Write a protein that binds this ligand. Structure first.
Ligand SMILES: C=CC1=C(C)/C(=C/c2[nH]c(/C=C3N=C(/C=C4\NC(=O)C(C)=C4C=C)C(C)=C\3CCC(=O)O)c(CCC(=O)O)c2C)NC1=O
Ligand SMILES: *[C@@H]1O[C@H](CO)[C@@H](O[C@@H]2O[C@H](CO)[C@@H](O)[C@H](O)[C@H]2NC(C)=O)[C@H](O)[C@H]1NC(C)=O
Ligand SMILES: *[C@@H]1O[C@H](CO)[C@@H](O[C@@H]2O[C@H](CO)[C@@H](O)[C@H](O)[C@H]2NC(C)=O)[C@H](O)[C@H]1NC(C)=O
Ligand SMILES: *[C@@H]1O[C@H](CO)[C@@H](O[C@@H]2O[C@H](CO)[C@@H](O)[C@H](O)[C@H]2NC(C)=O)[C@H](O)[C@H]1NC(C)=O
Ligand SMILES: *[C@@H]1O[C@H](CO)[C@@H](O)[C@H](O)[C@H]1NC(C)=O
Ligand SMILES: *[C@@H]1O[C@H](CO)[C@@H](O)[C@H](O)[C@H]1NC(C)=O
Ligand SMILES: *[C@@H]1O[C@H](CO)[C@@H](O)[C@H](O)[C@H]1NC(C)=O
Ligand SMILES: *[C@@H]1O[C@H](CO)[C@@H](O)[C@H](O)[C@H]1NC(C)=O
Ligand SMILES: *[C@@H]1O[C@H](CO)[C@@H](O)[C@H](O)[C@H]1NC(C)=O
Ligand SMILES: *[C@@H]1O[C@H](CO)[C@@H](O)[C@H](O)[C@H]1NC(C)=O
Ligand SMILES: *[C@@H]1O[C@H](CO)[C@@H](O)[C@H](O)[C@H]1NC(C)=O
Ligand SMILES: *[C@@H]1O[C@H](CO)[C@@H](O)[C@H](O)[C@H]1NC(C)=O
Ligand SMILES: *[C@@H]1O[C@H](CO)[C@@H](O)[C@H](O)[C@H]1NC(C)=O
Ligand SMILES: *[C@@H]1O[C@H](CO)[C@@H](O)[C@H](O)[C@H]1NC(C)=O
Lengths: 1002, 188, 49, 49, 49
C-alpha cells in the first residue's frame, strides 16, 4: 500500500551544537509528503532496493523483522536479533528461502561462510511506541540514526545518531529479513539528495524544518532563511530549459592523418635543423600514439591527451628531431638550457605536446654516429619556433677572424658521438612535438568521432567542428559569403554557424532562461502562492501570460484596484475573495472630473487639522573594522604577507572612520540647531491644546515623551566593533524637548534670535495668517481646532501602537547594516580556493613556503570582501547624509518656522511641526490645515459700479444667487462689498466677465 | 542574453501619461487647491490673477491685458513645439543616462571575451581541452575577473542610481512646489 | 564552475541583492514623482480657459 | 586562542562542539572529562589618544 | 576655511596612496617592472608581471 510522510524522517546531520539558529543543510533526506510504503507482511522476504538510503518507521509490538542485507547482486549480512547487533562481511551463499527464525530454529540466511572479511558483535540489550530509523552509507561509513517515542502520526521528531561501523562495499540491493514460525505495521521510506532548512531552539534541538525543494513557498523560505515570509514578491530561483540531446556535426572526410611516416621514419633530422611536417585536412587518431607504450614520455601542455580524440584543430605541426638523453626536458615551454635557447625554443603559450622515446638502436652505432649535430654557440637566443641554419663560426671575442678557427673563434655546430656504448644519460632520444593551434578558424584536423543528424527548433548541445555550445538551431536568412563559416554578434557571440556537411546557415539562439519569482501574501495570512516565470512564453513550462512573463497560480480579474504586490508592466496581484490570489491592472485612483466653468468657484466653509508623520533616517551605526585582525587573526606571518600589499588597510580604516565621524556630524546638524535648552513652564495653559503626549514626563527615568517611548519599542568579535554615538538618546530627547518648548512658548522667534514668549493661540493666529486665513477664523473656532488637534494626536498614538510597519524606513536601514556585517563575517568561512578557511589549520598542516601561497590566496579575497563592504557602506552613508540634510532642512523650515513650500512639511497648508527622536532617526508630526466641506458659488473677476470697475483687495467676489459678497479665498466668510475691501482700476468695458452690481460706501 | 535581463517598469508609459494629464487637469481647473485637499474649481483667469498677486503684481494688470497674455502664452507654447521638433540635443540629459547604462552593459558583455590570463575566454573549450585538475585552475582564473567585472558594474550602477535618485527627488520637489503650487524660490 | 564559485562565498547573493534594490528604487522614484495626485482628474469637454 | 569558561549549554550526548550564528566555534566538549566549555575571544579593541 | 582645506587634503591623500602602491610587491619578487624584466626570462617574468 502507500501513505504520506507528514514531515517525518529528519535527523541531526552532524554532531555540532547549534542554538537558536536557522541552518541550511544539503544531504540525503526523506522528502516531505512523500509516498512512504506501508507493509503489513504476515508471518522469501520482501526485497526493497537500497537506492540511496532507507527510512524505516515501525510501531513495533513483535519485531518479526530479523535482519538487514546489503549488496551489489547477492555481501553485508547485518542482524539485529533484538538483543545484540551482529555484522558479517563474507561472500555468503544465499539460500532458496532467505529468512531466519522468529526462537531461532533455522539457518536459512546462509548455509556457510567462506573467505570472511569482517565480523562484529555489539553489546547485549533487550501500538504505543513508534521507532523511527534511518540507514544510509557515505563513502564507507554506514550510518544509523534513530528515535524511539511513545504515541504515521503527524507532528515532528528529530532523529539522534547511533552506531556507525564503516564497511565500504558496493550496495545496489537491500533486504529486510522475515521469519517463519501474526503481523504488524512497518513503513519504508527512501532518502534522496535534498536541501533542508532546520530550526534549532535554545536547547539546541531541532523543532521544525523546511523541505525547501518541495514547493515555491518553501523555496522562498529557504532563500530568505526564514520560516515566515511577509507579503511581497521574491525572486527565488532561475528557470532554464535543459538541452534535450547532443548534436555532433563534423566534416565528411575519412583520410587518416600521416602519423606513421613521422614516427616510423628511419631518419630523423638533427636538432639544429628540426624537420617540420604539416598535418591538415585529415582525420587524426591520437589514441594509437598515447596508448602505445613505445614512448618514454608523452606530456602535454594546453590539452589533456585523453581528450585529444574529441578536439578539432585548425592546423597541426609535427616537428621531429633527436637529442641527447637528459636534455629531453629542455624541450618544453619556458625552459632554459643549451638546446631550448640555441636550437629549439617553444613559446610560453605552447598548445600541444611532446613525445620522447629512447632510440639506442638505429641512431647509435659503434665507433660513434657523428651525423647528429647541434649548434652550441649563437650570437643571441632563439625566438619561439624559428629554425636557424648556418655554419658561420662564433666570434667569441672581438677578433674579426672571418672564418679561420683559432682562439675566440669557434665552430658553432658540435656533434654527438652516439654509440651503443654510451650510458642512459647520453644515449640518443627521438622526439616529436605536436603544435596545434585552436579555434580561430574553420577546423581542418578533427578527431575520429562520428557525426550525427541535426535537429532544429529544439534546445540541444551542438558541436560544429569542435565549436561546442548549447542552444536552439533555426533555419536562417543571413547571406553568408561563400568563404564565411560562422557569424558573430555585436556582443561577440556566435550567432550563426554554417553546417560543414550541408552548406546552409543556422541561427543559434540560447534556449529560454529567466528568473522565477514567487508572488505570496504574508504567510500569516495564507499559504497559497503564484509564480511568475519572467520574460518567457509559457508554452515552454490558472495560467495567464503578461508583459512581465507568465503568471501561474493567480486568476485574472477585469476589475481594477490599487496595487498590493507589484508584478510589473501595470500588473499587481493581491489576496482577495472563497479566497485566492488575483492579478489585475492597477487603478491609478478614483476617476474624477471637477465641474469647471468660467463663472463657478468652490469655496470651503469648514476645515480639518491633520497631523501626519514623516520618518527620516539621520544616522547609522558607527562600525569600525581593522584588517590585521579580520584578515590575519593574530598570525604574524600573515601580517607580514599583508604588508606587501601596501596601504589598502590604512585607507580602509580611514574610510570607515570618516563614515563614523559623519554620523555624529549628521546628528549634530539635525538636532543641535537650538543653542539653549528651553523648558516648558509647569502650567500647561496652551489655549486648550494638549501636548502631554509629546512633551517629556518626569514619571520615567528616561525623559522621553510618550510617543518617543512608543517609537523606541517599535524598531528593534572578528576585529569588528561598534562605536557608541557621541550623543546619547537622552541628549537627543533633551534637544527635541527644547525644540518643542521653543516652538510652543516662543513660536519661530527662537530660531532667529532670542526666544520671545507669545501665547500659543497668538502664534496660531500668526500661522493661520501665514496660509491666507484671517486670524478671526481661529478665535471664533479655537475650541474646535484644539479638539481636532488633540484627536489627531490621539490617532497618531493608535497608529503607532498597532502597526509597526510605519517605522520601516528606519528599520530597513538597521537591517541593511546588520545584513552587510553578517555577510562580512560569513566570508571568513570561505576557502577562496585555498585548502581551508582557517588560518591556523593551514599554518599547522603546511610548512612556510606552500603555507604562504594558501595564505596569500585567502588574503586575496578577505581583503576583497572588506573593500566590497566599505564601498557599500560609503554609498549607504552618502544616502544617509542626504536624508539627514533633508531632516535638518525640515527642522529648520517646518519646526523653527512655517514653510510655504508645498508638500514639504506635510499634505496641506503647513501650520507647524513637532520633532520626536527615534532610534537612528527623527519623526516629524506635521500639523496642517486641510479644507473641508465646500460649496459652489457664482463668481466674477470684477464688478462695475458707476462705469468704473472694482476688484477685490484680497478675496474673490461670490454670490449666493441674489447678493454679491467678497470673501477670503480659503474659507467662506462673505462680507458686504465696500469701497475698502475693493479697489478701483479703469472702466468696465475691458474686463472679460465683469458683472453689474452696487458697491456700498460709508 | 548572458544572464542579463531588463525588468519592465511597474508603471507603463500610459499610466505615467494619465498621471500627468490628471496633474494638468487639476492645475488648470482647480489651481493649487488640489495639492492641499479636495480640488476646488476656479475659473482659469482667476487663479491667474491669484498668481500675479503672488509675484507682487495687482490682478487688474491681468484683466486689462488678458487677451495679450493669452496670446503670448500660446505663442510661447508654439515655439516650444518648434524647439522640440528641430533640435534633438535638448533631451540630451535623458539620452546620456540611457547611453551610460547601455555603455556599461556592453562593457559587461565584452568582458566575457577576455582570457584574464587563462588559455581561453570560453569555458567549454577549457573543459573539453583539459582534465579537471588543471581545468579548475584556468576556470578559477576566469572567475576571478568575471566576478571583478560584475563588482565594477554593480558599483557603478549603485553610484549612478544615487545620482538618479537625487534627480528624482529634485523632480518630485519641483512637481510639489512648481506644479502643485507657486514657488517664491528664485530660479527654481 | 558553479562548484568552484561556491567557495568564494556569498558575493553573488549580495550582488543580486544590490541590483534588486536599485530596481525597486527606480519604481519608488517614479511613484514619488508622478503619483502625487490621489484622484485622476479629467478636463471638461469645453475648453473655455 | 581564547578564554575558557564553564558553560551552561545542554549538549546532547553525541554532540562534541557548538557553533555560533557567525559560524564560530563557540563551545567545546573536553575529550578527557565530559564537560562543556564556552570559548570567548580574550579582550581586544582599539586604543585612541 | 577647513571645509575647503579638507577637500584638497583628501584628494592629495588619495593621490599619495595611489603612488605608494607602486612600491608594493603584491607578492611578486619586486615592485619594479624593469628589474623583473632584467632578472627573469619571459615565461616566469610574465607570471610576476
Ligand atoms: C534493532 C536494532 C536496535 C537498535 C538500533 C537499538 C537502539 C536502542 N534501543 C534502546 C531502547 C530499547 N530498545 C528496545 C527494543 C527494540 N527497539 C527497536 O527499535 C527494535 C527494533 C527493538 C526490538 C524489537 C526496548 C524494549 C528498549 C527499552 C524500552 C523501555 O525503556 O522499556 C536504546 C537505549 C538503550 C539505553 O537504555 O541506553 C538504544 C540505544 N536497540 C535495538 O534492538
Ligand atoms: C466643521 O467640522 C467640525 C468637525 O469636523 C464640526 O464639528 C462637529 O459638529 C457636529 C455637529 O453636527 C458634532 O456632533 C461634532 O461633535 C463636532 N465635532 C467636533 C470635533 O467638535 C463643525 O460643526 C463643522 N462646522 C460647520 C460650520 O459645519
Ligand atoms: C491632555 O491629554 C491627556 C490624554 O492623553 C490627558 O490625560 C488624561 O487625563 C484624564 C483626566 O484629565 C485621565 O482620566 C486619563 O487617564 C489621562 N490619560 C492619560 C493617558 O494620562 C490630560 O489630562 C490632558 N490635559 C489636560 C490639561 O486636560
Ligand atoms: C443670499 O444672501 C442674502 C444676504 O443675507 C440673503 O438675504 C437675506 O435673507 C434672509 C432670509 O432669506 C433675510 O432674513 C435677510 O433680511 C436678507 N438680507 C437682505 C439684505 O436682503 C438671501 O436670502 C440669500 N439668498 C440665497 C438664495 O441664499
Ligand atoms: C504515489 O505517487 C504517485 C506518483 O508519484 C501519485 O500519483 C500518488 O498519489 C502517490 N500516492 C499517494 C497516496 O499520494
Ligand atoms: C529546554 O528548554 C526549556 C524551555 O523553558 C527549559 O525549561 C529546559 O530546561 C530545557 N532543557 C530540557 C532538557 O528540557
Ligand atoms: C559526405 O559528404 C557530403 C558532402 O556534402 C555530404 O553531402 C554527405 O551527407 C556526407 N555523407 C556522410 C555519410 O557523412
Ligand atoms: C608504425 O607506426 C604506427 C603508428 O605510429 C605504429 O602503430 C606501428 O607499430 C609502427 N610500425 C612498427 C613496425 O613499429
Ligand atoms: C508565445 O507562443 C505563441 C505560440 O504560437 C506565439 O503565437 C506568441 O507570439 C508567443 N509570444 C508571446 C505570447 O509573447
Ligand atoms: C474580462 O474581459 C474580457 C475582455 O477581453 C472578457 O473576455 C472576459 O469574459 C471578462 N471576464 C469577466 C470575469 O468579466
Ligand atoms: C457644483 O456643481 C456641479 C455641477 O452642478 C456638481 O456636480 C457639484 O457637486 C457641485 N459642488 C458641490 C460641492 O456640490
Ligand atoms: C463663459 O462666459 C461667457 C460670458 O462671461 C458666457 O457667455 C459663456 O456661456 C461662459 N461659458 C460657458 C461654457 O457657459
Ligand atoms: C450693466 O449696466 C450698464 C449700464 O448700467 C449696461 O450698459 C450694461 O449692458 C449692463 N450689463 C449687464 C451684463 O447687465
Ligand atoms: C584517562 O581517560 C579517562 C577517561 O575519562 C580520564 O578520566 C583520565 O583522566 C585519563 N587519564 C590520563 C592520565 O590521561
Amino acid at each position: 500500500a502507500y501513505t504520506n510522510s507528514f514531515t517525518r524522517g529528519v535527523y541531526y546531520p552532524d554532531k555540532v551544537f547549534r542554538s537558536s539558529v536557522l541552518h541550511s543543510t544539503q544531504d540525503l533526506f526523506l522528502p516531505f509528503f512523500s509516498n512512504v510504503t506501508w507493509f503489513h507482511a504476515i508471518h522469501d522476504n520482501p526485497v526493497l532496493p537500497f537506492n540511496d538510503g532507507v527510512y524505516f518507521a515501525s510501531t513495533e509490538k513483535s519485531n518479526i523483522i530479523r535482519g538487514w542485507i546489503f549488496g551489489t547482486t547477492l555481501s553485508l549480512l547485518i542482524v539485529n536479533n533484538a538483543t545484540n547487533v551482529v555484522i558479517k562481511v563474507c561472500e555468503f551463499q544465499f539460500c532458496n528461502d532467505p529468512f531466519l527464525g522468529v526462537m531461532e530454529s533455522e539457518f536459512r540466511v546462509y548455509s556457510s561462510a567462506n573467505n570472511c572479511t569482517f565480523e562484529y558483535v555489539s553489546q547485549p540489550f533487550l501500538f504505543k511506541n513508534l521507532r523511527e530509523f534511518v540507514f544510509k552509507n557515505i563513502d564507507g561509513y554506514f550510518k544509523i540514526y534513530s528515535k524511539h517515542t511513545p504515541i504515521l502520526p503527524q507532528g515532528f521528531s528529530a532523529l539522534e545518531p547511533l552506531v556507525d561501523l564503516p564497511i565500504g562495499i558496493n550496495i545496489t540491493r537491500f533486504q529486510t529479513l522475515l521469519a517463519l514460525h501474526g503481523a504488524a505495521a512497518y513503513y519504508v521510506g527512501y532518502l534522496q539528495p535534498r536541501t533542508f532548512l532546520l530550526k534549532y531552539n535554545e536547547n539546541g534541538t531541532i523543532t521544525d524544518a523546511v523541505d525547501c525543494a518541495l514547493d515555491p513557498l518553501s523555496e522562498t523560505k529557504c532563500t530568505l532563511k526564514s520560516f515566515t515570509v511577509e507579503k511581497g514578491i521574491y525572486q527565488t530561483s532561475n528557470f532554464r530549459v535543459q538541452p534535450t540531446e547532443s548534436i555532433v556535426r563534423f566534416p565528411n572526410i575519412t583520410n587518416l592523418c600521416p602519423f606513421g611516416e613521422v614516427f616510423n621514419a628511419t631518419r630523423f633530422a638533427s636538432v639544429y635543423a628540426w624537420n617540420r611536417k604539416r598535418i591538415s585536412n585529415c582525420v587524426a587518431d591520437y589514441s594509437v600514439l598515447y596508448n602505445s607504450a613505445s614512448f618514454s614520455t608523452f606530456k602535454c601542455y594546453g590539452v589533456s591527451p585523453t581528450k585529444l580524440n574529441d578536439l578539432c584543430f585548425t592546423n597541426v605541426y609535427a616537428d621531429s628531431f633527436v637529442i641527447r638523453g637528459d636534455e629531453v626536458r629542455q624541450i618544453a615551454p619556458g625552459q632554459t638550457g643549451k638546446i631550448a635557447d640555441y636550437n629549439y625554443k617553444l613559446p610560453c603559450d605552447f598548445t600541444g605536446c611532446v613525445i620522447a622515446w629512447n632510440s639506442n638502436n638505429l641512431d647509435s652505432k659503434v665507433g660513434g654516429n657523428y651525423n647528429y649535430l647541434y649548434r652550441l654557440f649563437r650570437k643571441s637566443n632563439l625566438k619561439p619556433f624559428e629554425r636557424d641554419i648556418s655554419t658561420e663560426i662564433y666570434q667569441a671575442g672581438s677578433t674579426p677572424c672571418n672564418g679561420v678557427e683559432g682562439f675566440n673563434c669557434y665552430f658553432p655546430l658540435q656533434s654527438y658521438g652516439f654509440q651503443p656504448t654510451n650510458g642512459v644519460g647520453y644515449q640518443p632520444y627521438r622526439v616529436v612535438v605536436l603544435s596545434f593551434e585552436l579555434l580561430h578558424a574553420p577546423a581542418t584536423v578533427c578527431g575520429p568521432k562520428k557525426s550525427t543528424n541535426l535537429v532544429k527548433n529544439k534546445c540541444v548541445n551542438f558541436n560544429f567542428n569542435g565549436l561546442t555550445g548549447t542552444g536552439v538551431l533555426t533555419e536562417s536568412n543571413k547571406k553568408f559569403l561563400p568563404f564565411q563559416q560562422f557569424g558573430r554578434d555585436i556582443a561577440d557571440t556566435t550567432d550563426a554557424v554554417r553546417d560543414p556537411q550541408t552548406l546552409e546557415i543556422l541561427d543559434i539562439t540560447p534556449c529560454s532562461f529567466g528568473g522565477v519569482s514567487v508572488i505570496t501574501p504574508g504567510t500569516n495570512t495564507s499559504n497559497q502562492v503564484a509564480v511568475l516565470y519572467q520574460d518567457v512564453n509559457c508554452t515552454e513550462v490558472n495560467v495567464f501570460q503578461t508583459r512581465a512573463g507568465c503568471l501561474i497560480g493567480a486568476e485574472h480579474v477585469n476589475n481594477s484596484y490599487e496595487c498590493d504586490i507589484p508584478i510589473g508592466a501595470g500588473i499587481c496581484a493581491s489576496y482577495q475573495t472563497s479566497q485566492s490570489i488575483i492579478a489585475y491592472t492597477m487603478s491609478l485612483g478614483a476617476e474624477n472630473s471637477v465641474a469647471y466653468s468660467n463663472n463657478s468657484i468652490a469655496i470651503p466653509t469648514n476645515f480639518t487639522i491633520s497631523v501626519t508623520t514623516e520618518i527620516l533616517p539621520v544616522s547609522m551605526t558607527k562600525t569600525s573594522v581593522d584588517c590585521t585582525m579580520y584578515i590575519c587573526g593574530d598570525s604574524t606571518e600573515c601580517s607580514n604577507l599583508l604588508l606587501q600589499y601596501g596601504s589598502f588597510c590604512t585607507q580602509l580604516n580611514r574610510a570607515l572612520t570618516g563614515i563614523a565621524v559623519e554620523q555624529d556630524k549628521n546628528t549634530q546638524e539635525v538636532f543641535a540647531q537650538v543653542k539653549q535648552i528651553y523648558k516648558t513652564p509647569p502650567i500647561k495653559d496652551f489655549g486648550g491644546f494638549n501636548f502631554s503626549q509629546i512633551l517629556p514626563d518626569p514619571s520615567k527615568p528616561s525623559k522621553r515623551s510618550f510617543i518617543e517611548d512608543l517609537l523606541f519599542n517599535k524598531v528593534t568579535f572578528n576585529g569588528l566593533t561598534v562605536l557608541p554615538p557621541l550623543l546619547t538618546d537622552e541628549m537627543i530627547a533633551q534637544y527635541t524637548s527644547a525644540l518643542l518648548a521653543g516652538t510652543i512658548t516662543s513660536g519661530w522667534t527662537f530660531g532667529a534670535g532670542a526666544a520671545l514668549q507669545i501665547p500659543f493661540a497668538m502664534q496660531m493666529a500668526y500661522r493661520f495668517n501665514g496660509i491666507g486665513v484671517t486670524q478671526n477664523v481661529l478665535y471664533e473656532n479655537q475650541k474646535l481646532i484644539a479638539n481636532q488637534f488633540n484627536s489627531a494626536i490621539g490617532k497618531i498614538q493608535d497608529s503607532l501602537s498597532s502597526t509597526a510597519s510605519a517605522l520601516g524606513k528606519l528599520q530597513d536601514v538597521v537591517n541593511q547594516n546588520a545584513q552587510a556585517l553578517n555577510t562580512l563575517v560569513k566570508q571568513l568561512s570561505s576557502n577562496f580556493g585555498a585548502i581551508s578557511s582557517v588560518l591556523n589549520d593551514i599554518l599547522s598542516r603546511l610548512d612556510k613556503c606552500e603555507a604562504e601561497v594558501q595564505i596569500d590566496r585567502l588574503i586575496t579575497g578577505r581583503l576583497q570582501s572588506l573593500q566590497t563592504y566599505v564601498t557599500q557602506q560609503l554609498i549607504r552613508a552618502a544616502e544617509i547624509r542626504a536624508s539627514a540634510n533633508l531632516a535638518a532642512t525640515k527642522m529648520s523650515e517646518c519646526v523653527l518656522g512655517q514653510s510655504k513650500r508645498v508638500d514639504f512639511c506635510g499634505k496641506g497648508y503647513h501650520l507647524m511641526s513637532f520633532p520626536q527622536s527615534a532610534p537612528h532617526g527623527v519623526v516629524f508630526l506635521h500639523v496642517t490645515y486641510v479644507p473641508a466641506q465646500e460649496k459652489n458659488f457664482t463668481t466674477a473677476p470684477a464688478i462695475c459700479h458707476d462705469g468704473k470697475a472694482h476688484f477685490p483687495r484680497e478675496g474673490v467676489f461670490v454670490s449666493n444667487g441674489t447678493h454679491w459678497f467678497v470673501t477670503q479665498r480659503n474659507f467662506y466668510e462673505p462680507q458686504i462689498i465696500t469701497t475698502d475691501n475693493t479697489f478701483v482700476s479703469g472702466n468696465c468695458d475691458v474686463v472679460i466677465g465683469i458683472v453689474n452690481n452696487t458697491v456700498y460706501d460709508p
